[PDB]
Design a protein around this ligand. Structure first.
Ligand SMILES: [Mg+2]
Length: 258
């Protein structure tokens, strides 16, 4: 396994997205790894069409709350280790985190919390960010190569959304959230899209408000990060705005080893 083409997508409900192209994306076999966030799958009851996909292994975690959160990873290769959650109950019970190790790297697939509903959920989001950073840093200390994909639910810089000056009081673009992303990258991680493309207008989420996606009034909420030790392995990093069916579009990257 010299090459990995990875795609990551918040589907805003997996059952619904299966009728709107997700199955096409998976069954095309274009991607070595397909990560989905926000499956909204209750009690491990996956859509039948997803259950016995062929040529892919698949792994899912569900939240305790039904119809909420949930993430899954499909891969052509069988992981050498599977861990559902970071090992902290108050975060693991929301089904936001799925680890799959491969021979060449550790993959963390994450649906980071949205902080808009309340102060308490903004607090939870920031606490989740802290736990995640400590978790990733411990693996990095051990010499793992880390790939982290998913929906961070924050636009890092002003260039990462179309209307920054309308959104500074909104979770998603709060100074403290952006500051946490600064702290994360400074610990030795790379925003893969920005390894190759410095330009604005590159978003991965748009409101369902009429015409917002057509007018590209968007936010870049979805990322793939790599630990610095993977810099020379990253050959491309993409956003896929042509893929419909959710309020987010996919993002991805390509790795090459050996
Ligand atoms: Mg959603």
């Amino acid at each position: 396994a010299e090459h990995y083409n990875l795609i990551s997508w918040n589907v805003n409900g997996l059952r619904a997205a299966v009728k709107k192209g997700f199955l096409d994306l998976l069954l095309e076999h274009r991607f070595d790894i397909v990560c989905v966030q926000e499956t909204k799958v209750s009690q491990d009851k996956l859509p039948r069409e997803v259950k016995n996909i062929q040529g892919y292994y698949n792994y899912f975690v569900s939240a305790e709350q039904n119809g909420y959160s949930g993430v899954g990873t499909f891969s052509k290769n069988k992981p050498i280790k599977l861990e559902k959650g970071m090992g902290i109950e108050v975060f693991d019970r929301e089904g936001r985190f799925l680890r799959t190790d491969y021979e060449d790297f550790v993959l963390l697939n994450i649906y980071f919390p949205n902080g808009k509903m309340s102060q308490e959920r903004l607090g939870y989001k920031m606490a989740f960010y802290d736990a995640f950073l400590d978790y990733a840093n411990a693996l990095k200390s051990e010499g793992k190569k880390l790939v982290i994909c998913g929906d961070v639910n924050t636009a890092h810089k002003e260039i990462d959304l179309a209307r920054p000056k309308q959104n500074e009081m909104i979770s998603g673009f709060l100074p403290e959230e952006r500051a946490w992303m600064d702290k994360f990258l400074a610990a030795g991680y790379l925003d893969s899209f920005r390894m190759f493309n410095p330009e604005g207008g590159n978003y991965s989420w748009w409101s369902y408000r009429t015409g917002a996606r057509s007018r590209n009034v968007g936010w870049r909420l979805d990322y793939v990060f790599v630990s610095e030790n993977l810099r020379e392995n990253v050959k491309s990093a993409s956003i896929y705005p042509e893929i419909m069916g959710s309020d987010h579009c996919p993002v991805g990257l390509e790795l090459e080893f050996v």
